[model samples]
Target: LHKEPATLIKAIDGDTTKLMYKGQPMTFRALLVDTPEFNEKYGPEASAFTKKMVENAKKIEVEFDKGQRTDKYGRGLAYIYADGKMTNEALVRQGLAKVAYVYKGNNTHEQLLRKAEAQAKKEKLNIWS
Candidate 1:
């Protein structure tokens, strides 16, 4: 697949579907970083994170390494980079997310994510409190 910088894409909706390479479909919960509330289930933090991400769309940059780029329901499961830095790590680091390594590819950022999550837990950031 011909990959390009994330700049070409405009705003992304939080509701994304996943697709598996095995011909089955799947769904991915937004992991730690939740989006806005359809019924206030996730609360304000989710909304805040969603807004932040929308604003940072100008900073998103993607690189394809390996392991089927998109997820099981057709949502692109990519290693996100924002503002020349790791986006997932930024979220986990900032206490906006928890570190989880379920995807086979791009495990390089896992350790930093764990560390960031640890720091956030230690200090009790945001929803943690």
Candidate 2:
């Protein structure tokens, strides 16, 4: 996967963020992960976790999926890598998000994410608990 450097504008939520890519500002939705909304369970924690991850990263990059690039809401669909770690999988491993929205050709990290989710579940972390 080819990753392009991006600057984080804001960590909007657990699974959504605003970033500047190629000098263009766009909203990106983390593929294959779903975190709770602000009003739901573990919502704030998830959002905070994401914010901290991106904010602390010295290098941030994004890789688009092979299938569709954007969702119905016009948000870019991609995987986020912060300081060489996949933040999408990290969310699941931390029990802040769940593996979801599996799409064909767009799930390059599905196996890795599922393993993370399983471990989170086994450990009974946050959302799994």
Candidate 3:
């Protein structure tokens, strides 16, 4: 689903919005700028990658979509947008994120994500990298 509540993310540092699990901070990038992560789940690479993504966020612009905007745990399940393109597609393009299929509000984006996955796999960027 195209995630609504799209917020322009400013930065990603010790700022662990996705780092935590109980807060709905991602829908709006400003909700949890520096909130601590008492109980978050992620692999070491993902955690480091998340931190780096946050850090890089300062250099780029971000926008989220509608539906499924927030995850069950309260974190944002948004469609990333940046640089005249969708960040979710970009993430998959870069081999950083996997394509997630939602049941509603996602006809165009889902296809884009699928295309991205195919390209990434064909190019063997992340999984093969």
Candidate 4:
């Protein structure tokens, strides 16, 4: 995985964001996690959480998995890091997102993410509650 420094342009949703990368603005979708749309249940809370996290971070970075750089919508598929914390996993731990869009044999960070989800479920946090 290659990590690239990026600047947050906006938090589009819980799992989608606009970022400035390499002097270009791009939309990125957080890998291995999915959050509801703005109008959906807990969606606004998730979005707010993401925005608060990223906006407060001193540095933000994104890392691409070994395969598939972009999704069908041309948004970069990545794991987002904010001040060294993996926001994808954090979202799951907070019960604001779920481990999703997994592919067989592409296990990068999957275990960590799943563990967070399991813990979140056990605690009945947010969406789980």
Clashes found in each candidate (C-alpha, N, C closer than 3 A):
9, 0, 8, 0
Order of quality (TM-score): 2, 4, 1, 3
**Tens-digit per-residue lDDT, 1-129, candidate 3:** 222332334334222233222233343222111222324332344335555555455333333444444546565544343334544455566555555444565334677667777897788865436
lDDT (CA) for every model shown?
0.49, 0.94, 0.44, 0.92
Query: Higher TM-score: candidate 3 or 4?
Result: 4
lDDT of 2 by residue, 17-67 (tens): 999988999999999999999899999999999999999999999999789
- When 2 and 4 are scored with TM-score, the better candidate is 2
Error of 1 at 119 (Å): 0.8
Checking candidate 2 for backbone clashes, the offending pairs are: none
- Best candidate (score: TM-score): 2
Write one digit per residue (lDDT tens) for candidate 4, span 16-59: 98999888999999999989889999999999999998999999
Model 1 ranges with Cα > 4 A deviation? 1-4, 8-43, 53-58
Q: Between the candidate structures 3 and 4, which one is better when assessed by lDDT?
A: 4
Off by over 4 Å in 2: none
**TM-score on alpha carbons, each prediction:** 0.62, 0.97, 0.51, 0.96
Q: What's model 2's overall lDDT? A: 0.94
Clashes of 2: 0
Residue 12 lDDT (model 1): 34
1-129 per-residue lDDT for model 1 (tens digits): 223454423333232223232334433233323333335443455445544663555554454445665556555565555466655555565565556544656454556567888887888876455
Model 2, residue 76: what's the lDDT?
90
